[PDB]
Design a protein around this ligand. Structure first.
Ligand SMILES: C[C@@H]1C[C@H]2O[C@@H]2/C=C\C=C\C(=O)Cc2c(Cl)c(O)cc(O)c2C(=O)O1
Length: 214
């Protein structure tokens, strides 16, 4: 028999949609910083579970290992960044990834148009959206101790979907799946990934592991 699944489609907040259009429809050099930004977000999420767990070690019942895995797949043309940080409840997810104005959007767009390097994006708290420098679609899978596992996705166009996830369960954390644009396949190459992690993400305080396909 036919199966059913519930999907929730949301509109990006207006300024977030404009920031996405700017990122997507305009050339920036130095696109490589997308990875620094996502690793930074993972490192922060790992910090939040680590410190919470000091007071309450049962918060690590869903996994003690606090790390980041990078998983390129040339067949799928995806680069996946997995963390075991605090994760997001559904409400956290819709709050952090698009429905709520972010304090730094306006300010960041005026800087970028004014000629700022895209590299400045992390400082304005909208670093996630640098994913769209290199990805035509982003999927974000998340699991928080207080909620079920959810899948977020967007190909921009002003909207994103949320659903309960029917893929692999994770114990806790967030997985960002970048569906790369056809001209951005260098970010699936192990040499390039290592180069950019060395250059931008050296002082991250959790182990990071690159899985190379043989
Ligand atoms: C909300 C939680 C915890 C916050 O500390 C992280 C800081 C910024 C995160 C912003 C996001 O939008 C969600 C997020 C992204 Cl994008 C990511 O790439 C990796 C992650 O682990 C999280 C996450 O789960 O973030």
């Amino acid at each position: 028999p036919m199966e059913e699944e519930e999907v929730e489609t949301f509109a990006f907040q207006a300024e977030i949609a404009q920031l996405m259009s700017l990122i997507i429809n305009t050339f920036y050099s130095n696109k490589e910083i997308f990875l620094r930004e996502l690793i930074s977000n993972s490192s922060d999420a790992l910090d939040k579970i680590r410190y919470e767990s000091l007071t309450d070690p049962s918060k690590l019942d869903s996994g003690k290992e606090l790390h980041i895995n990078l998983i390129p797949n040339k067949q799928d043309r995806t680069l996946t960044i997995v963390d075991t940080g605090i994760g997001m409840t559904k409400a956290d997810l819709i709050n952090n990834l698009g429905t709520i104005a972010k304090s730094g959007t306006k300010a960041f767009m005026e800087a970028l148009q004014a000629g700022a390097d895209i590299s400045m994006i992390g400082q304005f708290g909208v670093g996630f959206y640098s994913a769209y420098l290199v990805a035509e679609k982003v999927t974000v899978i998340t699991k928080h101790n207080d909620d079920e596992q959810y899948a977020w996705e967007s190909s921009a166009g002003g909207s994103f979907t949320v659903r309960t996830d029917t893929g692999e369960p994770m114990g806790r954390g967030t997985k960002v799946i970048l569906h790369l644009k056809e001209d951005q396949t260098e970010y699936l190459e192990e040499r390039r990934i290592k180069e950019i992690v060395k250059k931008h993400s050296q002082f991250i305080g959790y182990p990071i592991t690159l899985f190379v396909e043989k």
